Design a protein around this nucleic acid. Structure first.
Ligand SMILES: [Mg+2]
Ligand SMILES: [Mg+2]
Ligand SMILES: [Mg+2]
Ligand SMILES: [Mg+2]
Ligand SMILES: [Mg+2]
Ligand SMILES: [Mg+2]
Length: 295
DNA sequence: CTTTCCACTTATTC
DNA sequence: GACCTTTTACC
DNA sequence: GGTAAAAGGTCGAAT
DNA sequence: AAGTGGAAAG
């Protein structure tokens, strides 16, 4: 079983709540609904979804194209398990707001209100604040429903278990091989990083104080912006970052990448990265980790 | 009528 | 998220 | 004068 | 991450 806090961290990173309000000619109100929670991952981490499915005892696993796989929970009684978990081990990113909306929709459907037009309208109001908001057809059918900005969620990191889950989803353990004017001509630089949308700037900034190291990079692509929490000082990587995830085990393929990363850290600690033999081993490690891995 | 699941695509936050 | 080169800091 | 740390990104694809 | 169409089932 996956640790509940690690699960919530991973959910904060990768999870999503869904509310389908579909035009249905066979429905009494002309609309049918579907409520749920889902995680879609690369095929290589199917084992994560299976473990979550085994832990919660709910949800359906299915292919999501040829390179991805999804765990979806939409069966209404099973949603109580979802609610139970996140009431006890709450999300802390802006996704908490999505969960709260998911919970509101559940209440409407529990009382069977969604089978009446007033319940549908209420669900539309809920959906308008959920994820990417209303669709064009729903906006046209319910013009009185106005896109109101959501309030900001501001929660602190609850513990290192949550962080392990979150890092399992968003983190990167990287070995940078820098062309250098040194004896060996190559500088070995370990980099730890966590990426997140700027909507959770407060959470990302807190990482600096929560981990006692690192800095924030502000990145952008066209009109989109995100943040990168980065650590490049080796003493911080060795004495702070590595012990955290040694004690709080990562999940998925990324665990293997972290362990290869630690192999390099050990060589750097022993100053072997300044020898031909050590550099050779490091180059071989780098080639087989992250995107170099083969499945 | 209503719920549930399967197949599959697309935009962008990793 | 994984990856890169160039630049700057440090002793 | 040699080594480490930071800067400042790019872009393909797993969310 | 977030969405769509389709349809089996009682
Ligand atoms: Mg995420
Ligand atoms: Mg991930
Ligand atoms: Mg994305
Ligand atoms: Mg994402
Ligand atoms: Mg990856
Ligand atoms: Mg990803």
């Amino acid at each position: 079983s996956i640790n509940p806090w690690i699960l919530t961290g991973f959910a904060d990173a990768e999870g999503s709540f869904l509310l389908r309000i579909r035009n249905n000619n066979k429905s009494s109100v002309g609309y049918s609904t579907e409520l749920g929670f889902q995680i879609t991952l690369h095929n290589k981490d199917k084992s994560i979804l299976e473990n979550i499915q085994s832990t919660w005892k709910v949800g359906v696993i299915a292919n999501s194209g040829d390179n991805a796989v999804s765990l979806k929970v939409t069966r209404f009684e099973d949603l109580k398990v979802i609610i139970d978990h996140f009431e006890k081990y709450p999300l802390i990113t802006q996704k908490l707001g999505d969960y709260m909306l998911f919970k509101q929709a559940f209440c409407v459907m529990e009382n069977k209100e969604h089978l009446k037009i007033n319940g549908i309208k209420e669900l539309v109001r809920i959906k308008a604040k959920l994820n990417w908001g209303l669709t064009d057809e729903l906006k046209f059918a319910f013009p009185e429903i106005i896109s109101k900005e959501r309030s900001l969620i501001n929660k602190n990191i609850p513990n290192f278990k949550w962080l392990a889950g979150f890092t399992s989803g968003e983190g990167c353990f990287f070995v940078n091989l820098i062309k250098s004017k040194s004896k060996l001509g190559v500088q070995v630089q370990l980099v730890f990083s966590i990426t997140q949308h700027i909507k959770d700037k407060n959470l990302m900034n807190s990482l600096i104080t929560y981990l006692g190291c690192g800095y924030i990079k502000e990145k952008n692509k066209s009109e989109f912006s995100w943040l990168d929490f980065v650590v490049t000082k080796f003493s911080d990587i060795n004495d702070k970052i590595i012990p955290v995830f040694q004690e709080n085990t990562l999940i998925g393929v990324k665990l293997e990448d972290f362990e290869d990363w630690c192999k390099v850290a050990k060589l750097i600690e022993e100053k072997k990265h300044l020898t031909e033999s050590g550099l050779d081993e490091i180059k071989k490690i780098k080639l087989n980790m992250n995107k170099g891995r083969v499945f």
